[PDB]
């Protein structure tokens, strides 16, 4: 676990249509981050704000003697869009991610600064006291169910984005070929030692909440498509099933009939449509073994590395 | 909005079988861009004609004193792919389209070049006297409002070719690896700052448009493609509902007649009808799951860039 | 059509299980090639036969002042994989291509040397006397006409593999990123200038020919795959039909038991197999759909030239 | 056949919860590589093992004049990557693989090395004493029958992973953009002479075998993809067929009908049957011809050699 200390830090904060809750956020930032004793600096980005957002964040970084940078840009990309912006600019040894609305204290900085500072590469939060509906709740629970089954271990919580990234981990990323990702489970991918905290949580002091239903059924599929290519393979399953019910239950209808002879006058449409329903199902083995050379296709193309090392250990003779 | 001043201009037009237009299209043109007072440029491509527009080219580049240059290619490519063969050549600061069959007037050449030396990057334009058709009137309806949806903004008038461009926006889109475009919507990807102006509209004095029913339908799947992915996450929605809609539909005909009791003598297939209908609704569910890969692959072979900046603000310390 | 006059040439021929030929192939060929007069080479490939093939093609290698460079391959790749294997060697101005078989002539060569060393970058041949089997000629007639309405122009024959290119052809398909190909067609797509020349043709003096069914049928995939994506547009036209006469029909049923009341006892059946065909056609759409985006990402992953410039016209001052 | 003679060999072996067996593996393997009289190494490298494999490894690396490098992962990838991850760090000319749960006897060592020695590239191996049970024997059949007819040769058997290789064929394999593979498979393709040795097998000594049925699975897809993209080719054949009988029946129906008169009361409901099975085998159709082209973007993206060279043979003059 050993690593060099650090000496700087970077803090990276979105903002879209946040102007009510800004004016608190600099301050309640600026006291945090100077509470550190410790070289730091704030990064805010305008992700095509529509309103006064971009003025009060220029206004900022034209104080006397203002740590803060604003980066503007020509439309509305994400949240994670705007992230590797940030990311494309920092210059400390430690990064910190925070969001706008202020849902996430600013006094927590320095407890993940100090954790991180005893050489964990990526420290990660989870939210003491979290909010419970059936939705948030069901869907968190599958999700986290998926990603423990595929990467190994659970993450906690993988929607609190108030977490910290020694710089290699960026450089890493930001070389990355995919266009879309999901920050922290991309972070997992080269982390050779992780370790968490837990945190309180608060509702949004101003405003409304931006993630439509739209807006979040795009990140969900962003997100199992980052993780994952197993939901091609389900095609395959369902077909043969199908396949196989078909055809023994047309099986079983022509021995029922040579059996104990006629029965009904709807008996060869029964089996047509038994015959229809293993062709059905034929067409959806065929879809799978498209979808096969698809995923391969794709993770040829992302172009991610073929293992990690986590660290070698040769003799005292070479 | 700040920019260097322009010092030099070229003027680009796609030339495909118009030899009846070709004379008065070259002595208007020369007339304007000697009328700005500035260094000027002409290049004219020939896309495959079939005519004698190759003859009189070359002649025009042959007479004393001319500021044309002639491009020649082995076949018919198409009006972008002509225009991008113009880009590859040009050598002044500001560039300026132009149609051969003389519809763009070519005295609005200065406005352009004035309102581009004003410093804005990328300048359009809108036909103030447009032809309205039902045809073209709800296609163009349709695809404003696509391109307002995707882009965030509305550009006034896709379909006039009559713009300007300064270099560092051609540079950047001749590099691109997309095989097949659509140039004014490209240019807004890699737009700091753009403009329009009103510019009036007439029919073509010879000839006949060269834009037939399959070269319209190809030109319109090209603009689609390149706009979105969209179209591939509508299979889902269909397949969900007509699902839906069948499983409701057996339930209710299973209760009901458990309820009251046979009705019919067709119920059974019915039934089967129902049953069949679910199963299509979920192969439309598995192609639109196929295409959500399909579409990342074909953004991530692309390789446009993650985020545009449109400008960024230090501090007087960095 | 100026070019640089050509003083050596190489001839490249792919083996297969042709011991027979072989003997009377060199000699024959050596004499063709002493008679021009000019210097001159010929480059075996053995496409992993079986017989003694390999043994000649050493021995002959080995023979005093022999001109004749043997190479093997580990396993059976094809003819055209050969073909580029001897490219791969080539060291002349000018490349012939020639089959083992004996059907072509070798006395033909000196006339396509003269005719290349008049300026032009690819000369053709027609067979004169050409067998006509309805099999053979149908292909042949589908296949020319599908070329010339891709391409813009027929080539006369394409089964003629007696060909003559010049060396940058020869490098610049060289470096194509695609793996299979079809060398002609190839050809034309960077060839500034084409001829052709008539030839007569024999049957194979000894052995069977070695293209089988299967073996064919792949060879008209790869030609198909490698002039058009066409046939991925065919789809959604055959679906809106299906689509269309459908939703007429089921219309027209309900107007008319509506206006004339009940007629059958089959009625409702028929309405629900009307939907069932308008839903088969929407299945056809969306696979169209797909292919799309499909055959963009082909293209883009092919990365062939945008545009080809057959030649560039300056004025007396640049 | 001539090569440079071995000096060096390195040793491979994946390690996946195997604390029994390990302390055994080690002196076993010991004893058989210092009985060659040749310079050694040993690489273990943990797929990351739940259990005390690493420390094991940590400690026997640790002891004195150890020859043991141990390579520890963040996670389970598979035991192709973690050999591939081995193969990154040899620094022998040899390179021998080797299972960890001691079924493979490493006193077969030395054999390989001598034969591979007189000059092979890649040494396999047969286990003489082979368990026989169906699904294994079935399994294996099949496979090697496909192998077989894809590569021109069978390598008598692909399950068994005690190999050797030369470092040229590791370096050429290590560079591959492909991220799954099955190495036996993938070193045939660049040997340029290969041959077997006759070896016992026995069943291991202690704990469970780890491949599941899953685990399994995803190893038969691993295989067949990597060999052929042939299967994407019987869909259009089922298509054909399906189609080519639904419209042979219907035709007979209507001529029955015709020339008998009516027959039955469901006559058509069967004509529609009909009609129905011959769209459907259109969709097949379909289908196959989207797979064409994606397997021509998976070749594409792959981008293995188009050919391999076996020798090449020039006269006495160049
Ligand atoms: O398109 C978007 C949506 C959100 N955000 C930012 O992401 C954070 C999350 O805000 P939101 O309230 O939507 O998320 P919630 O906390 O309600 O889940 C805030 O800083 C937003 O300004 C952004 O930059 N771009
Ligand atoms: O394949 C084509 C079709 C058109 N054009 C050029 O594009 C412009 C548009 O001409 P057209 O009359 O077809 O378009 P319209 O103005 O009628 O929409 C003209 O300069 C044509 O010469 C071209 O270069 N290649
Ligand atoms: O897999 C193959 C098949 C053919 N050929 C060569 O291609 C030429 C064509 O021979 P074939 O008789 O099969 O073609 P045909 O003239 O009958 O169409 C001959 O030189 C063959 O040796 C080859 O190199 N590899
Ligand atoms: O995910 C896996 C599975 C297996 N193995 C190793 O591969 C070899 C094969 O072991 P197993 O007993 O599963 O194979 P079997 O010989 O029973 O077919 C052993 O050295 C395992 O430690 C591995 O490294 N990773
Ligand atoms: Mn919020
Ligand atoms: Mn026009
Ligand atoms: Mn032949
Ligand atoms: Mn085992």
Not at 181 to 194: E, K, S
Not at 234 to 251: E, P, Q
């Given at each position: 676990?050993?690593?060099?200390?650090?000496?700087?830090?970077?803090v990276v904060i979105p903002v879209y249509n946040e102007q009510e809750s800004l004016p608190e956020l600099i301050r309640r930032t600026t006291?945090?981050?100077?509470?550190?004793?410790?070289?730091?600096?704030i990064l805010l980005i305008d992700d095509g704000s529509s309103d006064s957002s971009a003025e009060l964040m220029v206004k900022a970084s034209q104080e006397?003697?203002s740590?803060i940078i604003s980066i503007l840009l020509?439309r509305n990309?994400?949240q994670?869009?705007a992230?590797?912006?940030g990311?494309?600019?920092?210059?400390?040894?430690?990064?910190?991610?925070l969001d706008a609305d202020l849902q996430n204290?600013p006094?927590?900085?320095?407890?993940?600064?100090?954790?991180?500072?005893?050489?964990?590469?990526?420290?990660?939060?989870?939210?003491?006291?979290?909010?419970?509906?059936?939705?948030?709740?069901?869907?968190?629970?599958?999700?986290?169910?998926?990603?423990?089954?595929?990467?190994?271990?659970?993450?906690?919580?993988?929607?609190?984005?108030?977490?910290?990234?020694?710089?290699?981990?960026?450089?890493?990323?930001?070389?990355?070929?995919?266009?879309?990702?999901?920050?922290?489970?991309?972070?997992?991918?080269?982390?050779?030692?992780?370790?968490?905290?837990?945190?309180?949580?608060?509702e949004r002091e101003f405003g409304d909440s931006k993630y439509?239903?739209?807006?979040?059924?795009?990140?969900?599929?962003?997100?199992?498509?980052?993780?994952?290519?197993?939901?091609?393979?389900?095609?395959?399953?369902?077909?043969?099933?199908?396949?196989?019910?078909?055809?023994?239950?047309?099986?079983?209808?022509?021995?029922?009939?040579?059996?104990?002879?006629?029965?009904?006058?709807?008996?060869?449409?029964?089996?047509?449509?038994?015959?229809?329903?293993?062709?059905?199902?034929?067409?959806?083995?065929?879809?799978?073994?498209?979808?096969?050379?698809?995923?391969?296709?794709?993770?040829?193309?992302?172009?991610?590395?073929?293992?990690?090392?986590?660290?070698?250990?040769?003799?005292?003779?070479?």
């Amino acid at each position: 676990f050993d690593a060099a200390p650090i000496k700087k830090v970077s803090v990276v904060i979105p903002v879209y249509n946040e102007q009510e809750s800004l004016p608190e956020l600099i301050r309640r930032t600026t006291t945090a981050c100077e509470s550190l004793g410790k070289a730091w600096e704030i990064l805010l980005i305008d992700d095509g704000s529509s309103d006064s957002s971009a003025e009060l964040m220029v206004k900022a970084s034209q104080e006397a003697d203002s740590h803060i940078i604003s980066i503007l840009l020509n439309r509305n990309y994400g949240q994670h869009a705007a992230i590797m912006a940030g990311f494309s600019h920092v210059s400390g040894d430690l990064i910190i991610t925070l969001d706008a609305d202020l849902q996430n204290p600013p006094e927590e900085i320095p407890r993940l600064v100090a954790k991180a500072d005893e050489g964990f590469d990526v420290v990660g939060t989870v939210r003491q006291n979290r909010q419970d509906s059936l939705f948030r709740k069901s869907a968190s629970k599958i999700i986290n169910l998926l990603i423990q089954r595929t990467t190994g271990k659970a993450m906690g919580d993988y929607g609190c984005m108030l977490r910290a990234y020694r710089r290699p981990i960026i450089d890493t990323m930001l070389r990355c070929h995919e266009r879309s990702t999901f920050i922290p489970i991309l972070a997992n991918i080269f982390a050779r030692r992780a370790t968490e905290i837990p945190v309180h949580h608060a509702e949004r002091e101003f405003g409304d909440s931006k993630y439509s239903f739209m807006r979040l059924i795009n990140l969900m599929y962003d997100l199992v498509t980052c993780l994952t290519t197993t939901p091609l393979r389900l095609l395959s399953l369902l077909g043969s099933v199908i396949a196989i019910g078909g055809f023994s239950l047309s099986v079983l209808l022509i021995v029922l009939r040579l059996a104990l002879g006629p029965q009904w006058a709807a008996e060869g449409v029964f089996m047509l449509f038994a015959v229809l329903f293993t062709f059905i199902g034929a067409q959806f083995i065929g879809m799978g073994l498209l979808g096969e050379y698809i995923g391969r296709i794709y993770n040829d193309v992302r172009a991610r590395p073929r293992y990690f090392v986590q660290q070698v250990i040769y003799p005292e003779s070479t």
